[PDB]
mmCIF file of C-alpha atoms in Angstrom:
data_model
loop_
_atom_site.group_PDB
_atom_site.id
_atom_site.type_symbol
_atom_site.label_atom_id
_atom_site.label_comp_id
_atom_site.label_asym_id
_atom_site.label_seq_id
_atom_site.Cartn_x
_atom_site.Cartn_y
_atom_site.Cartn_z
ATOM 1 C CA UNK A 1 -112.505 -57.570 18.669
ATOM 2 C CA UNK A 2 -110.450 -55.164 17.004
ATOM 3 C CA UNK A 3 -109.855 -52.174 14.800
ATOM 4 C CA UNK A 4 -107.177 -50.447 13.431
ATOM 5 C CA UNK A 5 -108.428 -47.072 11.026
ATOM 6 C CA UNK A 6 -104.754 -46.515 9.915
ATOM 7 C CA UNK A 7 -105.572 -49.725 7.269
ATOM 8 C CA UNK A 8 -108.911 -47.612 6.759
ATOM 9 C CA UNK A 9 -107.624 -43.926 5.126
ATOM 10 C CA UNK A 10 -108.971 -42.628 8.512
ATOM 11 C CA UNK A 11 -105.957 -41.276 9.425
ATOM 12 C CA UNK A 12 -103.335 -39.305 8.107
ATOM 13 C CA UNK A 13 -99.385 -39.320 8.703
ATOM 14 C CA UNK A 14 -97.944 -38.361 11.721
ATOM 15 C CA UNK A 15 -97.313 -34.801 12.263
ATOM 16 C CA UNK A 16 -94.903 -32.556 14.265
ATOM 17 C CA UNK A 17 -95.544 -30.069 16.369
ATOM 18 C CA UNK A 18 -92.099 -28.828 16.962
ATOM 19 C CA UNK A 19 -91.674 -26.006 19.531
ATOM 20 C CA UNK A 20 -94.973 -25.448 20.482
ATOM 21 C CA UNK A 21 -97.909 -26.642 22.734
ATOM 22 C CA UNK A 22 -100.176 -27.547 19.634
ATOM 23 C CA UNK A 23 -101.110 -30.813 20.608
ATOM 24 C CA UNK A 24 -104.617 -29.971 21.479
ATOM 25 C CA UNK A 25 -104.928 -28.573 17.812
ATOM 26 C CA UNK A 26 -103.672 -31.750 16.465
ATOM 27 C CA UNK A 27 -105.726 -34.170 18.307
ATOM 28 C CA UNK A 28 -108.416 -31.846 17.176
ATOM 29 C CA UNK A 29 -107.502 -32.006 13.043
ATOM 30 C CA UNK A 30 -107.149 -35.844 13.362
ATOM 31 C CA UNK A 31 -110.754 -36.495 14.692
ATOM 32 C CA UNK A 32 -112.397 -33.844 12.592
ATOM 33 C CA UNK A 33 -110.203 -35.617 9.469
ATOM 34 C CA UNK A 34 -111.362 -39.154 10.701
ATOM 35 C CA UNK A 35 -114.874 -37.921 10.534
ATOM 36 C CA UNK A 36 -114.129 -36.295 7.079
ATOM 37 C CA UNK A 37 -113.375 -39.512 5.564
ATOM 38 C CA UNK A 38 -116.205 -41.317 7.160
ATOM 39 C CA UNK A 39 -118.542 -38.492 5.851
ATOM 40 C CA UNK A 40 -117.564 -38.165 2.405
ATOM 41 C CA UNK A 41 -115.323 -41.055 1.670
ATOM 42 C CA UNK A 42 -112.012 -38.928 1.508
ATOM 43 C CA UNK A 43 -109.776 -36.821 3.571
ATOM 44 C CA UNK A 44 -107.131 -34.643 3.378
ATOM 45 C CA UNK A 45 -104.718 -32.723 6.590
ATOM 46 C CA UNK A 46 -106.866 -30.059 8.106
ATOM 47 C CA UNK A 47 -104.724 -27.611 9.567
ATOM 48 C CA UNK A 48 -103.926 -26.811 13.299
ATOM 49 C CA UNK A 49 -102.563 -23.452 12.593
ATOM 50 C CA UNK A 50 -105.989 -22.331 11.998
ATOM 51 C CA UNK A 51 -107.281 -23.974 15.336
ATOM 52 C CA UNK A 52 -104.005 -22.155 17.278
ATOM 53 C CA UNK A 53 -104.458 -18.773 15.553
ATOM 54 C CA UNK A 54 -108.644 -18.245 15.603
ATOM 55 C CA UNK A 55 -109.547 -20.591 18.988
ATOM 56 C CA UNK A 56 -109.749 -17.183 21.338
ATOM 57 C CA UNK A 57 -110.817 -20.186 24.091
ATOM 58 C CA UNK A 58 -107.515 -21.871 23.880
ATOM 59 C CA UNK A 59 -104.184 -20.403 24.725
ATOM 60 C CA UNK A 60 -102.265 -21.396 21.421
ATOM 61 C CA UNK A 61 -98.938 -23.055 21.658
ATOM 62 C CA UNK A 62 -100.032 -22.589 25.788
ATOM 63 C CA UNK A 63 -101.860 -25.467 25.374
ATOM 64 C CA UNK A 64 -106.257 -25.923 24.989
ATOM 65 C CA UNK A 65 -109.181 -28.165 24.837
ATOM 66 C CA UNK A 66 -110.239 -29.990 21.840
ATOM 67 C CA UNK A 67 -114.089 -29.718 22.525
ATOM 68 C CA UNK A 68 -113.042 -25.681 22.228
ATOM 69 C CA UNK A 69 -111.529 -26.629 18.863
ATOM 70 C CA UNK A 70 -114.476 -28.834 17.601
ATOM 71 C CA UNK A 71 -116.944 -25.968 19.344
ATOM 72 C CA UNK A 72 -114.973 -22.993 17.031
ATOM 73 C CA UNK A 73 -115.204 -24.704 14.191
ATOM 74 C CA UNK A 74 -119.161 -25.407 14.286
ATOM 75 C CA UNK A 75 -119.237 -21.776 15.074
ATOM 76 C CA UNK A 76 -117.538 -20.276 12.152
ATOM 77 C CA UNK A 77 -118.415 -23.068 9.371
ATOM 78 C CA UNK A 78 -115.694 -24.737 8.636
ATOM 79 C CA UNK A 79 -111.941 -25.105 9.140
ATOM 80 C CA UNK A 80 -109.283 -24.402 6.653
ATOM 81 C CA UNK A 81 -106.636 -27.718 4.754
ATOM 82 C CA UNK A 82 -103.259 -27.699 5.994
ATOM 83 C CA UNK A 83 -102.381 -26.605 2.469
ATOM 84 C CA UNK A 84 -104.518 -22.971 2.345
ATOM 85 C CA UNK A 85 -103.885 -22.485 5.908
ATOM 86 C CA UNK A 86 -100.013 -23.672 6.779
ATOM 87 C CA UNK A 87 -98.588 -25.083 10.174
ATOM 88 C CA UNK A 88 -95.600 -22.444 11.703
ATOM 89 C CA UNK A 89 -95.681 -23.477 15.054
ATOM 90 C CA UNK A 90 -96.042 -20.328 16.335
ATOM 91 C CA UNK A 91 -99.610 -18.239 17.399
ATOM 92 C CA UNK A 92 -100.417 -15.667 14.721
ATOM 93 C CA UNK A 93 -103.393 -13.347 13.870
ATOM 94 C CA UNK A 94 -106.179 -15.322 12.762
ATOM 95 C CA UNK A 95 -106.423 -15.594 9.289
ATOM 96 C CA UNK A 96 -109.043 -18.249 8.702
ATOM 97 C CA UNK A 97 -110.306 -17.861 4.757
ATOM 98 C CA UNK A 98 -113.639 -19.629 3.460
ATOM 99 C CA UNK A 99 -111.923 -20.786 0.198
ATOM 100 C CA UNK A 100 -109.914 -22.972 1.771
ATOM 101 C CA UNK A 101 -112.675 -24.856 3.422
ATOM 102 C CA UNK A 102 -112.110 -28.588 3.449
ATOM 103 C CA UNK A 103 -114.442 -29.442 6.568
ATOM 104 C CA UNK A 104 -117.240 -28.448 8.968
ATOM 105 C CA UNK A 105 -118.416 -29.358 12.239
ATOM 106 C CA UNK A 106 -121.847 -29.499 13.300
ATOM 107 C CA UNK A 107 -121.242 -30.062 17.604
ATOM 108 C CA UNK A 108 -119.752 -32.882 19.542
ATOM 109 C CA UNK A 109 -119.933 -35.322 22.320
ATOM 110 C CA UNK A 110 -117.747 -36.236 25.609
ATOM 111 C CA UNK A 111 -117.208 -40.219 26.381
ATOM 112 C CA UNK A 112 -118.107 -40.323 30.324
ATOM 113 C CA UNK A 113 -115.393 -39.417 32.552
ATOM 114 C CA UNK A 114 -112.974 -42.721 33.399
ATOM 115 C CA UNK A 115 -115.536 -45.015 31.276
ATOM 116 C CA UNK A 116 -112.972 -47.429 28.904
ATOM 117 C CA UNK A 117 -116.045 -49.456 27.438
ATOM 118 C CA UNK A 118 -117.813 -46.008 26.711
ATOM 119 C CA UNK A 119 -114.406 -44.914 25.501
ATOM 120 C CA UNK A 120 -114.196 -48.713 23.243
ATOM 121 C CA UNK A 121 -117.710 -48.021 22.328
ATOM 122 C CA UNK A 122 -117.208 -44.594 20.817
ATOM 123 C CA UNK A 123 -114.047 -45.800 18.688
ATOM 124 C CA UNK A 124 -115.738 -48.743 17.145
ATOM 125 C CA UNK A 125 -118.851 -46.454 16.473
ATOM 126 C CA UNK A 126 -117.520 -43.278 15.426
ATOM 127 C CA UNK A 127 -113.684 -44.023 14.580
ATOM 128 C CA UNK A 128 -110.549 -42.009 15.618
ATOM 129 C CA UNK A 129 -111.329 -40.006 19.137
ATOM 130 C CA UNK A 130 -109.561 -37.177 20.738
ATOM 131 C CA UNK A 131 -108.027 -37.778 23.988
ATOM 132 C CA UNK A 132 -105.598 -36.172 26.746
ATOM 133 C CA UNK A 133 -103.652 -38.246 28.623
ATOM 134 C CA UNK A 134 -100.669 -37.642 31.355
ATOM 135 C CA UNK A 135 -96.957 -37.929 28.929
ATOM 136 C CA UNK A 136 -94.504 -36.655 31.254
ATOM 137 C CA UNK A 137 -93.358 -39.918 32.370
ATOM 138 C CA UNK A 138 -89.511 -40.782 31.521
ATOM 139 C CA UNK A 139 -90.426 -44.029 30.298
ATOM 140 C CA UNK A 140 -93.393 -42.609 28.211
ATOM 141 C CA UNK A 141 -91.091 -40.570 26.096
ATOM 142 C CA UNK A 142 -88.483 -42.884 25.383
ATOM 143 C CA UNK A 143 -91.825 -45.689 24.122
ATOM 144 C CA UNK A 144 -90.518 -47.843 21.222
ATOM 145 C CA UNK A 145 -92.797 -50.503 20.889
ATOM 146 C CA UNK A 146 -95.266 -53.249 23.061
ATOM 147 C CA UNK A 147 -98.035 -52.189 25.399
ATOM 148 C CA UNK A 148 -97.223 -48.847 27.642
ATOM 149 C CA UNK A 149 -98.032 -49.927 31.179
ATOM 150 C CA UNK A 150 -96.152 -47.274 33.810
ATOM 151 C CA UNK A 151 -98.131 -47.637 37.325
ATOM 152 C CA UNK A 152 -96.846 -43.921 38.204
ATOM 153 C CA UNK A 153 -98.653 -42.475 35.376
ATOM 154 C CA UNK A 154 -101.029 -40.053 37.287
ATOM 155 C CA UNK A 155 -105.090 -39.982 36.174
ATOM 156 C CA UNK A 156 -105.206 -36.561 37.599
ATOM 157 C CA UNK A 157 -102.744 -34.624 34.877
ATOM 158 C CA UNK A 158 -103.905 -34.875 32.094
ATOM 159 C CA UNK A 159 -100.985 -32.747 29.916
ATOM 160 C CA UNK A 160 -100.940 -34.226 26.762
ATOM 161 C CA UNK A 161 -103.516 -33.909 23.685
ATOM 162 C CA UNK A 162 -103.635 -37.298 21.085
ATOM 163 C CA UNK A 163 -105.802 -39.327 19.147
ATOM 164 C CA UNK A 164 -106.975 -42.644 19.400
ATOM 165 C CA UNK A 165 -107.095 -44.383 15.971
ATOM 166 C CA UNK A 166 -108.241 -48.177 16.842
ATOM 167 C CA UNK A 167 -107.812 -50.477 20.276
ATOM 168 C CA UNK A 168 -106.709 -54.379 20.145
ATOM 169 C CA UNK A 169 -104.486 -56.875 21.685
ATOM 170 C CA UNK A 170 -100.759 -57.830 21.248
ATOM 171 C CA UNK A 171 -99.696 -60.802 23.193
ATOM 172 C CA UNK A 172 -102.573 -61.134 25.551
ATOM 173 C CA UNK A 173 -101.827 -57.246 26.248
ATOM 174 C CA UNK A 174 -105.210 -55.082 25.304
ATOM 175 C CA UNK A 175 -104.051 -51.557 24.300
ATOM 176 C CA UNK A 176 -105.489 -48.574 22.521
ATOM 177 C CA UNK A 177 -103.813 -47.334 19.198
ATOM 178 C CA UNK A 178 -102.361 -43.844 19.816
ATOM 179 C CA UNK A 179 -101.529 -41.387 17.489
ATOM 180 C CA UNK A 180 -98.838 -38.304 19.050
ATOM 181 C CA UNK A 181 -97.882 -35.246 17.208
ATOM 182 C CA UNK A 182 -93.868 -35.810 18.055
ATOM 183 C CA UNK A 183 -93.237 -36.553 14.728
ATOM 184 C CA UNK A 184 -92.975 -39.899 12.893
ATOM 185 C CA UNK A 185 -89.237 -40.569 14.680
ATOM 186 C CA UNK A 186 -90.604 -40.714 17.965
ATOM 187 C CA UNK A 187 -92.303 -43.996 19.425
ATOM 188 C CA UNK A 188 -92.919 -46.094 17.208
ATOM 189 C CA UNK A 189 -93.048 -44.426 13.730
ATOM 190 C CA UNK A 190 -95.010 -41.976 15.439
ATOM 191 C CA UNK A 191 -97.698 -43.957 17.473
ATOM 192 C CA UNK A 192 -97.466 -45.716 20.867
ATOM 193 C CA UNK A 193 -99.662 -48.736 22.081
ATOM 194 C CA UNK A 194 -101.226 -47.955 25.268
ATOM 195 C CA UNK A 195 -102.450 -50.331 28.251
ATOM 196 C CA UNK A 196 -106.281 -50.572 27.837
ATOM 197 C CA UNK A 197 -108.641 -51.810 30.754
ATOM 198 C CA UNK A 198 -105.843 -51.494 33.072
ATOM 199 C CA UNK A 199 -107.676 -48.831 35.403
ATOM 200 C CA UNK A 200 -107.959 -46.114 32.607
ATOM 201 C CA UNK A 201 -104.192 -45.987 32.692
ATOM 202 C CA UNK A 202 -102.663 -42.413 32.512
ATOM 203 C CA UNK A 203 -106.690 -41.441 32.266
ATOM 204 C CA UNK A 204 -107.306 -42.428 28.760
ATOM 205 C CA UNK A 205 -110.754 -42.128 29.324
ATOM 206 C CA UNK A 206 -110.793 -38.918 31.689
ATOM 207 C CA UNK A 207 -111.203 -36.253 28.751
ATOM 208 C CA UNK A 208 -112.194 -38.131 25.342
ATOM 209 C CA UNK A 209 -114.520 -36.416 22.828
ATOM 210 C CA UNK A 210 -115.106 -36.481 19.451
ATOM 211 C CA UNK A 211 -116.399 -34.115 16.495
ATOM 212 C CA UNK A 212 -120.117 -34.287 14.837
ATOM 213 C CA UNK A 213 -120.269 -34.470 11.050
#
């Protein structure tokens, strides 16, 4: 019982989002691109620039919630491609245009609060799903590779936006498939395994939605 939508075209590569608190934007782009792909059989990078400039609910590189993101983009009809509407990592005017339109939105859904197998369910169902989970653990940052277990990781703070692209097991470890926005040098090329069914370590489950299609 596995799945892994990297080997799927579900994803795309790991981006960075350099000096600024885009995160939420990011995790936002990946699910709505997942969703692309399952919709229409191809994808392509949606931009965050578009989420940080226009997403009045958010506070740009300040940080935000992705069901903002997915609840913008229902509202106004679409979302621009990275390519028509490019990342700066910076907050600008908003500057949304409806040529470069490369997806839409049409509402979304929260996984109940703490609930892994709702959280397991949703993956397996849907595919990649945004998530926020607490980073600011040392020994989170400096993740190369295995199964991130850190007891200290606190439920309760949840500061960091990401995606979760598949779940499985690596020697007898479960673990959910996580895709950052620290570039592809960080972790491992970009993505860090992360303890699963281990009391919704670092709240996994705590704030996990994903976009309707």
């Amino acid at each position: 019982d596995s799945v892994d939508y990297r080997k799927k075209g579900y994803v795309t590569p790991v981006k960075n989002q350099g000096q600024c608190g885009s995160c939420w934007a990011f995790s936002s782009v990946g699910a709505l691109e997942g969703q692309l792909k399952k919709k229409t059989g191809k994808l392509l990078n949606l931009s965050p620039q578009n989420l940080v400039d226009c997403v009045s609910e958010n506070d740009g590189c300040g940080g935000g919630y992705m069901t903002n993101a997915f609840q913008y983009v229902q509202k106004n009809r679409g979302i621009d491609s990275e390519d028509a509407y490019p990342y700066v990592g910076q907050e600008e005017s908003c500057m949304y245009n409806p040529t470069g339109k490369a997806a839409k939105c049409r509402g979304y859904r929260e996984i109940p609060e703490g609930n892994e197998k709702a959280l397991k369910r949703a993956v397996a169902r849907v595919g990649p799903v945004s998530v926020a989970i607490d980073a600011s653990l040392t020994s989170f940052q400096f993740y190369s590779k295995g199964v991130y277990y850190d007891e200290s990781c606190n439920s309760d703070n949840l500061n960091h936006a990401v995606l979760a692209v598949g779940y499985g097991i690596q020697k007898g470890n479960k673990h959910w498939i996580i895709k950052n926005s620290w570039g592809e040098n960080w972790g491992n090329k970009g993505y860090i395994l992360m303890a699963r069914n281990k009391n919704n370590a670092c709240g996994i489950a705590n704030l996990a939605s994903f976009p309707k299609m």
